Design a protein around this ligand. Structure first.
Ligand code: ADP
Ligand code: ADP
Ligand code: ADP
Ligand code: ADP
Ligand code: ADP
Ligand code: MG
Ligand code: MG
Ligand code: MG
Lengths: 378, 378, 378, 378, 371
DNA sequence: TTTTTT
């Protein structure tokens, strides 16, 4: 029969082209589910799959006028839509899917069954994803300097590890976190270390979504956190200076449901899946709109008490009560952090903590007995 | 003469392609009506029906350029439009229509007269639609814990059942329902169970449809409520605070009308069909701009008075006067909801309730003796 | 010579295709003038007229690539434009034009003379257009309950009849009517009956047409009421609340003009012909920015006083002065309205009322005494 | 040599297609110059000039694909622009140019010299352009009623005649006339008479051209008033209200230049020729943004005094201050103007007035002493 | 082979098509560097140039699709852009250019090296470009009447001549001129004279260019000054009130730059080359955002002290202090102004003044001794 | 501002 239809049927039998509910046509090229709303990539898959089909078909898929016919046949056989990103314990890279339960790494068809549209952005190095490397020792030194293992810092370190490790789970979390500490403590260092580990599954969204009604008009500060594993918010100002807004309590309750309401510019889609692990990076203790039992259930605080200063104010910083350690400020850190040195070394630590803390079910618990207002209300 | 016109005529005689009043071309593929404003699906239908014509006609539909000719002929033969969704007592799925008055599943031509352009988005498996199941007992235990079967909570339970079961009828409901209660009481669990049950006939919007005006400029928060059978507008703020917009009474009055005025972006269609049951999962007592009988005859309140807590906070919850019974939290409940485990059991429960409350006429009644301001005006 | 040129000239000899001043190519299919700026309509008529040409010509029109050549010729032979909708007292249906003055129904070539570009959207049943019928008997009871035929409600009843019957004549009306009354008095029932009666010549818009500037940017709320014979703008909010926009004084003046300024999206046409009977379904008395004699001559108010109540709250309706009668609510009325039961009985009633007040000349008059502010100014 | 090139050259030899400085392609069909960016005017002309070519060149213009080739050649052959609408004392009609200074109606090729692109839209009849006729008597009575010939209404009647007769000359004016007066006085009747007299050369625009900056993207409210003789911007609101825009003094400077900017949707033509006679039908005297000495020289105001009252409210009008005559209303008058009964009578009256004020030089003079602010500044 | 490619190469070898840095293709048809971003004129140029090619090639350009193929080839072979409008001493017309250093009119290939994309809007006829004419005498009388040719107004007259004549030099200018006077003193008369003389190389703007930042929102008032040789800013309010925005120093310091940063509606090109002599006409004393030494080196002002009133108001205006001579309002003066009879004469005066003042170096010197 | 355009 029509031999340009047999090619389309054979290509479709591989389940390489899929139709999503949002109207996209996700394709499977180079071990990744890529999609582009502006230009479909079906003709890319048709040309890439050329080697699987027999020799009698390969000579015909080179002409673009035949590739267009094959794409037209394919688009008329995808009738139903499927579901995407339904596996929480899977981290999608640019060349496979890392399994978090047993720390495996599947590529090819083995990674095809997990339909994950998002990706980390970079490739996975099985040789660099090891616990025996000088990078791992350097990282373990940096982390222990930021958060020591002293018994005075026992719970605060386990909570920190839990919060950081929950940044790899593709499931909805029902608790915020507050990276609270004085200046020059490691919050922006932890943020940069985490961004170097996940990459594309990370946005440092604006502060405006703590004090603004995210309902009227456009708000791309919300539409960006669609399927993002981690969302970081900084810039908590003083609540006594002019412009002292209040962290809207009802707004905190909105960033806990699996679907957040908000649309981008020139768009009609109003619901965004909430896989984020929102971490508010603050320096001063936050002042809330109004405290109630519904608000105290979805907040955790990770205290930061360690100062990395230059040998000018070291003694003055030591005399201060806001810190507990006065370790020496290093300059090579920001060099080999933005340059992605401790990328896989931090990934191994995150996977280890994820195994230690959330194997059966991923869940974040509040710590309300840390904020003075909450302590008063308790 | 032209056989590509005979094919189009034969396809037209089957009454598989129809023209709607909005200008869409609804096709009939896989026992369900489908449409897409961006790209027509007539070619999909032409290629699909190919298995119902003789051999001399079944081979001509493989070439896309010969399919566009049939599509052009079909578009040129459709003159007069039709009206859709005229049957309120039917629930459409991806593979047929369930008749609620008899609880009978019709597939194929048996369910084609009921031109339902919407669907739940999943198949209907008749093996999970029975009482004899382990999942049904678990769902019964969950619901009887959220709303206990006592005698001080009998009218409330009946109102809750009526409100939940009204989400299957595709008619205009003239009441607004508030899910009022303290934190951790079962409101979001009910919302998620309803979403799993009715599937895609369920849209969650922001609160901007109650505090802003739905007339100026675009408003896809209202344009998305077209032909949807349930709407959730949860997370009401605290109107007792300073700077909280009250609920506009006129906005409440619009939402209980057969047609709601509101347009999407880049669109001129200004009218949308209101088949939705609007439920406001609130946490505080609502406050309105003005109170009058027209507002008092459109509001119903159902209360949640069962707190699900951990053993850690089990003691502070018993002294609270906002609860009637304290149960133990279930950490794994959320996992087997997003997996659609209690999906068809809840569907059977809703159908059973609809068979009991809304058989002759479907109607929702107000409960003015639940808001203190309404009680004063009573 | 050219077969297709002769085919195109023959179609133009039938005077079926026409060009209007607005730039629309109206065609004559199924005894009705139809126009649509996006769908292919000239090819539709070309395919439909096929059973007029001889056999040697009737076979070429089965190829879509040949039906576009004939359309291209027809679009080139049309030089001059014509004027449409110049008869005010003719009501067009989907299969003819009803003459209001005498009641004769023309179908076929006799209806081609009145170039009415709009239509009701359904056929005209001469069998149901009779005075003696069960539905006509129930409708009379419904109306006599909504507006009783007493002696203190005779001027109001005749004003209501005038306003309702004026929705059939396609001429500019220089007055706006307010359906005033407390809740549950029969206004929405009248609106639904009118919508079922006049069909497509009825558009419902928001109150943005009353309090906004209807001139800047796209505005499909004004662009949609082009040639519509009735425009309902319900849901007027309270004005006693500080924060409510008053009804703009000049908008009322602009809406009573033979041509309204406003354009839809993706278009340049800025003039819409005003045939509408604008009816505002309000609950409280309207408040304007400024009151002047230029505005009291453009406003009429008709009151609804019969209250339809449930047996429980019936007693409370006997002490409110806002009612003159307490009828018992019929729960099944809305079922047999959306099903188009009183469609032709109401049409007969509207025609009978029309040829009793508007036969010499159709004109509407204001009632300034029925509004407190105008009463003060007068 | 070529066959489809000689046809294009011959069509050019007839001087039927011309290019303007704005990029328009004006064609000559049916004794009139026409330009339309949407319709295929060049292809219509190619089909219509088919009889003036040799027999062998006539049989090729039947196929649309040959006509498109001829049109493509014609577009390439036109490399130079020509001046259009240079004669200001000529009035175009659907079938020829009428000379205002002399009075002879130039029909056919004799009207080709005066390249008048715009037209009135209706054929000119010399049997109705007569001086004496019952229609003329009725029109003269109506005009004398609207503006009485009394001694006080002498300096105002001639200004009214000047303003009305300036709408025939196709030259840029320098004043903005305000039809100031109370309600039911005659402004709308005068506007309707002028519209029915001058046909297509009349347009009505919104108040954006006065109270908004006309330089934001597309603005068809300005692109529509290109080469139009008269423009109406009626129904001005009150300015001494809690929130209301102003006349934007700077915006009046732009409306007197012959280079008004503003492009229609889907087009690039930004600058439009300004032959318009801006007339604002208002009820309250305008309030500008800033009053300067450059504004009193481009503003004229004519007062309307004669009241048209119903027999009922006639006594209340005889005591009103802003009225000089209480002549009875006429219901059967405003229905006849839309029937173009006084079309040619009003055209003859306008020509008679034109050959009384605008023969040597056409110029509009301002009347600044009428506005209170300018009177105080004097 | 591929005769169409040979046709494209032969057409391109004549430098009839050029590519601009802004991404537009400028063609050369009928003695004019035309361009149209929406509909390209390359096919018109191919059909026109058909005559200079051999008959074997010239017989193929009659088919509209061969022309499109050659156009595609031409657009493919234009890789690098060229610098246009590099000559400041040339005034472009609709059918030629004018050389002010020699006062010579160039037509045809004699004016193709001078790549002048913008034009004036009308053709040139040198027969009416001579002093020997009465309209010459009437216009010279008007000019000496608006600015007396005496010793009490010598420096003012020379600065007025310099500023008005600078409007022909197609280069950047670093001095903003102010026109100071009372009502009915001759500002708008000079404005209409300039608009009639030069035409398209002239844009009239509003007060907005002195009160708002030039890089917010879609603003053509920064983009419309592309290659324009004049900006006559009017509608300046009285600065002795409340709510009337004053003049910003940053605005003035920005307008005196060779390029201006500003993006039009639906466009990304923020750069616009500025060649405009900015003459702001005022009615009262100006006040700026700040007064410092960085500003008085770019601002010049001239005075007008002659007012015109009708013979009815002759004695009513013959007794005023703000003026010194009062003739009668001439209605016929404005008559042959939109008809543009007094167009080439004023052009001749401008050329004469340019030859008198701007031959060696083009430079405007500020006069901070009057404000 | 966005949306509308485009
Ligand atoms: N483990 C460490 N040992 C020594 N120096 C460190 C260590 N971690 C971070 N620093 C240095 O201290 C600084 C900490 O800054 P940081 O606390 O991230 O800023 P912020 O307080 O704004 O978040 C960094 O610039 C880094 O160079
Ligand atoms: N029988 C039960 N029914 C419903 N939820 C239960 C039950 N037992 C434990 N839970 C848990 O209690 C939690 C209640 O939270 P929820 O009521 O959804 O919050 P909200 O106050 O926003 O409605 C849920 O996460 C659920 O997993
Ligand atoms: N003539 C009638 N007889 C019996 N019931 C009626 C009649 N008219 C209306 N009803 C019922 O009473 C209710 C009136 O509500 P509605 O008229 O919509 O309120 P409103 O007038 O405020 O819009 C309707 O639901 C309708 O079913
Ligand atoms: N010459 C006339 N003789 C009698 N009635 C007239 C005359 N001119 C106008 N009318 C009446 O005046 C009415 C129009 O008033 P209109 O001009 O719309 O008021 P406004 O000036 O407030 O717009 C029409 O209904 C018409 O019948
Ligand atoms: N020197 C002059 N020669 C001829 N007419 C003049 C002269 N000065 C002023 N006028 C007259 O004054 C009017 C313009 O005055 P102008 O100073 O431009 O005020 P505005 O700027 O408000 O128009 C013109 O109509 C012109 O006839
Ligand atoms: Mg919740
Ligand atoms: Mg109602
Ligand atoms: Mg009027």
């Amino acid at each position: 029969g029509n031999k340009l239809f047999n090619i389309a049927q054979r290509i479709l039998d591989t389940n390489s082209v899929l139709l999503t509910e949002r109207g996209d046509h996700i394709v499977w090229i180079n071990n990744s589910w890529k999609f582009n709303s502006e230009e479909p990539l079906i003709t890319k898959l048709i040309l890439s799959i050329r080697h699987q089909l027999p020799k009698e078909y390969s000579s015909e898929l080179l002409c673009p006028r035949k590739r267009k016919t094959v794409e037209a046949n394919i688009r008329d056989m995808l009738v139903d839509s499927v579901e995407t990103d339904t596996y929480p314990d899977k981290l999608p890279f640019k060349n496979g899917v890392l399994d978090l339960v047993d720390g495996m790494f599947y590529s090819g068809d083995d990674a095809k069954k997990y339909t994950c549209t998002v990706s980390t952005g970079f490739k996975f190095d099985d040789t660099k994803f090891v616990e025996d490397s000088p990078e791992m020792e350097e990282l373990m030194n940096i982390i222990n300097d930021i958060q020591p293992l002293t018994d005075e810092n026992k719970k605060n370190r386990e909570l920190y590890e839990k919060t950081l490790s929950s940044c790899l789970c593709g499931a909805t979390k029902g608790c915020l976190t507050f990276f609270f500490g004085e200046t020059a403590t490691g919050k922006s260092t932890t943020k940069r270390l985490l961004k170097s580990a996940i990459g594309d599954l990370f946005v440092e969204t604006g502060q405006t979504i703590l004090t603004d009604v995210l309902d009227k008009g456009p708000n791309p500060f919300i539409a960006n956190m669609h399927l993002k594993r981690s969302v970081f918010c900084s810039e908590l100002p003083d609540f006594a200076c002019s412009g002292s807004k209040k962290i809207r309590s009802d707004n905190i309750k909105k960033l806990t449901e699996p679907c957040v309401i908000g649309r981008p510019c020139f768009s009609n889609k109003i619901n965004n899946r909430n896989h984020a692990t929102i971490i508010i990076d603050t320096n001063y203790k936050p002042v809330f709109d109004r405290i109630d039992n519904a608000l105290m259930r979805r907040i955790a605080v990770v205290r930061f008490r360690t100062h990395f200063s230059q040998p000018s104010g070291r003694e003055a910083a030591e005399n201060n009560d806001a810190y507990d350690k006065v370790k020496l400020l290093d300059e090579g850190l920001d060099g080999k952090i933005q340059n992605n040195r401790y990328r896989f070394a931090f990934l191994y630590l995150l996977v280890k903590w994820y195994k230690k803390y959330h194997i059966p079910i991923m869940k974040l618990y509040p710590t309300p007995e840390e904020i003075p207002d909450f302590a008063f209300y308790l």
